[PDB]
Structure formats: C-alpha cells, structure tokens
Amino acid sequence: QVLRIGGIFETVENEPVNVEELAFKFAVTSINRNRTLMPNTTLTYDIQRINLFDSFEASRRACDQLALGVAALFGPSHSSSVSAVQSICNALEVPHIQTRWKHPSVDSRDLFYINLYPDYAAISRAVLDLVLYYNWKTVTVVYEDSTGLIRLQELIKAPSRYNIKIKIRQLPPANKDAKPLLKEMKKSKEFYVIFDCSHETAAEILKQILFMGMMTEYYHYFFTTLDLFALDLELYRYSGVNMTGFRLLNIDNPHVSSIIEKWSMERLQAPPRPETGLLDGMMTTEAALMYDAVYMVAIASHRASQLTVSSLQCHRHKPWRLGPRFMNLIKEARWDGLTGRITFNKTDGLRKDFDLDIISLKEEWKKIGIWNSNSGLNMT
Amino acid sequence: NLFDSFEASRRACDQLALGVAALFGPSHSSSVSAVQSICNALEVPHIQTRWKHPSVDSRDLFYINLYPDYAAISRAVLDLVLYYNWKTVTVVYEDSTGLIRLQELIKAPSRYNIKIKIRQLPPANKDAKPLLKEMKKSKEFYVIFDCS
C-alpha cells in the first residue's frame, strides 16, 4: 500500500530557511533512496504550512490533512500547539508523535503521547554521579529560567544522602546582564560552575567569560547542551582548563560520516546560515532526533501491512479503525539510531536508557569515558 | 467527563455557535489550552479560574485570569521569612510545580547568607515519616509546607 503522512510545522519569522523541513526532506529522500528495505513500495509525504503563535489554525489544518488521509501527525514545533492537537488525536483513534518537549500530566493517555526527547532525570543523575566521581565539594550551577531546575530536581536534594555545598546562579533574559553576576561570583571566590543552558546561549556565555579574562586553570566548566561539538571551542591558546561535557551523538557507523559530509555539502549549496555559531558538516540535536523519528516511521511502515489512510472529519467524529494497530507498530519497534538504543515504557512516551559520552577539549573532541543508563559510568 | 479536551473543545464550539459574551472554565490546565486557542482564533474575551502553565509566545489579550500567581506569593514568602530571619531552613515540595513556585527560595543563598534543605514527598500518597525523622535529626526545625 501507499501511505501518507502529515507534516505540521509552525513557520518561524526572520528565517525563510527553516532547516527543520529541510532535514525532513532529506529524511524522506534518503529513505526513498534506500532499496534494501521496501515496506511495499516508496512512500510519499503531505506538508502544510502553519504560522507561529497560533495553535488552532494548525488544528484545522491537521484535521483537513486527516480528511485527506495521513498515517500520523508530525509536530507541533511549539509547546503551546502540542497541547491542543491531542484533543483531536485522542478522538478518531489518532496516534501522535511529538518533537517538542511538554510537561507530563495525568490527562495524558500514554497511548497517543510519544516524544523523541531524552529523559531529563537521567541527565540530572548523570551529572550527579560525575560530580561524585571527580568529587567537587563546591558546585555552582547557573540557570536562566524557572523551568531550568526542573532539569535538575536531584542536586538540590543532594546534601541529604551525601554532604555537599551547592550554589546557584540566575541570569536575566537579557544576555547583557552577565557582568554583575560574573563580577559577584569572581569576588565570591567561586571557581567551579556548571552550565545548564541550550545552544542558543552557549556562544554568548563563552564570549562573555572570555572578555573579562577568566580563562585560568582554576575554573572548570560543564555544559548541558549537546551541541558542544557543533559550537567551536578552539578559542583557547592552551587547553589546560578542564572542559567537560556530555555527548549523545557519535561519529561511528560510517553511514554517520556519509550523512555529515552530506549535510556539509547541502549547507554549502544552502543559502547563508542564520546563526553564526553553527558550522557545516555536523548535525544538531533536533535534526538527529527527528531523523530518528523518521526512521521509527520507516520501520513502522516496513512492518505495516494491509493498511490504508482514510478520510476523517474534525466536524463529523468517527473512531478510525487503524489507530491501535499503527500505534502498536510504533510501540514494538527496535532500532539503535543516532540516539542509541530505544526503550519504551507504559508510564510515558519519552524514550529512556541512553548513554552519554563524556568529552574533553582537544589540547591547544576527545573521548574519556562513558556512562550507562542502568550501570553507571565506565571510565577509560 | 474529567480530562477530555476533545469534548471540551466541542462544547466550546457549541457555545460559540450559540454566541456568548464570555466563556468560563474548564478547570483542567490541559483542557483550557485547546479551547483557549480555539477562542483566540475566534478572538473573544474569556475568563479562566485556575493557574495555567506558562506557554505564551505572543501577547494575547484574550487571556483574562483571576488567580493568585505564584510570583506574588513568592515575594511574599521571601519578605516574610526575611522579616523573621533565620540561618537554616528546609523546604518540601510536591513536584516540578513546587520548583516553579519556589525558584526564589531555591535562589535564597545567592542574595543573602542562608541555608536551605530541599525535601520532597513520595508521589504515591504515602507517609514521609523518614524525611521528617532525618530533618529533626539534622537539628533543624523550620520547614515550609508548599502543598495543595
């Protein structure tokens, strides 16, 4: 059979490039270029364009695409738009996969909620046993917003079972406000800091810390972003200061080398990039996880059989028969992608059991150990 | 029926088909978002009665809330504890929402010298008798109870 898929992307202003659907186009193109796995034939997509800052427009467009007939829904790309679409997803037996983070609730039915984001409690536990491993009695972690510590529920209760000294830093949303915090921490004799931020602020943080001359080996820097390779770190004349970070991606599986050189060449033929921190030839987190989601749909289609899309109305509501079967196809897939092994639980739709590579900066990146999800860290 | 955003959305559709000057409810933060987007698309005034998770990206004047925000509560609890000052305190919360509404007490070491112990009750409706046992064994007697 020939199936259809609905691509719900919210257009972001100041960027007509929108690398997200470009990544999706490569995903569908490459899966159509691989011939050793035919589900029954080639597969085709359906895409409609939605503007940002409005979810119910995406709602009509999703139900119109469903009336056209699609196997599942991709997105939405905004947190607010995620909440609304499960209203129709729950009805008509519509499974949904999410590419945007959302707070787990009790209204959520674990059958139609699937997200490709890693478990954040694992990240908190990982930084816990790492700081236990090298044994920092003094730790300062900086966050930007209220949600930041919901990444880190456990280090706040760390002094309970294990004695420790904990300090925290907060920055106003204006990145030009880093000078008072930085001067007060340097006058506080605070030398060990852990960064809980994303890639949108790593460059500004590093340039700010570079400007006022805090490059001494006394400091030790850690990041929660996963694009540590995606951002350039060869800014230190001597790389003697301990740079520590986590890596979930890998350069092994020479198909990964093929796709990185791929991405390099299209970005060369792409229009000029909108972010100066990005350099060609190497993936970001969102692109990798959404490639893995496309892979999940690929094996779902390959294991799919005797399945067709149907015209379903958001105004006339009838439960569509192939909901649970497609959700099962999603639910018992096995694959070791760019994120590693995939594990499923009936308590949520997030993926679990990930392994994080610890990275050290190249001397003036490097692999120095590994952490297992269920057996701790293995050092080399 | 509790926790059904689809039926709430259809009831909102019925109400707007009738035509109303204001819409009240629902009481589920999960459910209010869908109807809120529906009615923002339909651009009508509305009043909501419970706190909703921050998920705003553009200024919507369509969202008229009457609920004690956690932020005023926050500055209130800070100035109260500062008035009757201490050196060591302890905090216990329910879930991430407790973190959202107590980020400032978490930050309390930064602005002034103060010690906070961060506790959390099991999410199974069980007894935290150990937690309090080690808390009294810690020679600390002053714990906030942030709870519904």
Report the distance separating Cα A87 and Cα B28, nearest Å.
Answer: 13
Q: Which two tokens stand for residue A10?
A: 């919210």
CB nearest A146 (choices: B33, B40, B103)? B103
Closest residue by Cα to residue A29 from A19, A42, A41, A40? A42
Tell me the CB-side half-sphere exposure of residue A164, using CA atoms within 13 A: 22
Distance between CA atoms of residues B101 and B79, nearest Å: 15
Distance CA A113, CA A109 (A): 7
**Residues B96 and A142: beta-carbon distance below 8 Å:** no
Surface-to-core class of residue A290, CB atoms within 10 Å of its CB (0-12 exposed, 13-18 middle, 19+ buried): buried
The token pair at A290 is 């959404």
Determine the distance in angstroms separating the CA of A149 from the nearest CA of chain B, rounded to an integer.
Answer: 7
Sheet containing A242-247: give its strands across: A165-170, A138-143, A192-195, A220-223, A242-247, A356-360, A366-372, A376-379
| B125 reaches A (C-beta below 8 A) | no
How far off is chain A from B103, nearest CA to CA, in Å?
A: 6
- Distance in Å, alpha carbon of B72 to nearest chain A alpha carbon: 15
SS3 B37: helix
d(C-alpha A189, C-alpha A141), whole Å: 15
A84 near B CB under 8 A: yes
Experimental method: cryo-EM
Resolution (A): 8.2
Q: Is the bond preceding A76 in cis, omega lying within 30 degrees of 0?
A: yes
Pairing verdict, β A340-341 and A220-223: unpaired
- For tokens 């995939």, what's the residue? A342
Cβ atoms of A57 and A17 within 8 Å: the answer is no
Pairwise CB contact (< 8 Å): A147 & B120: no
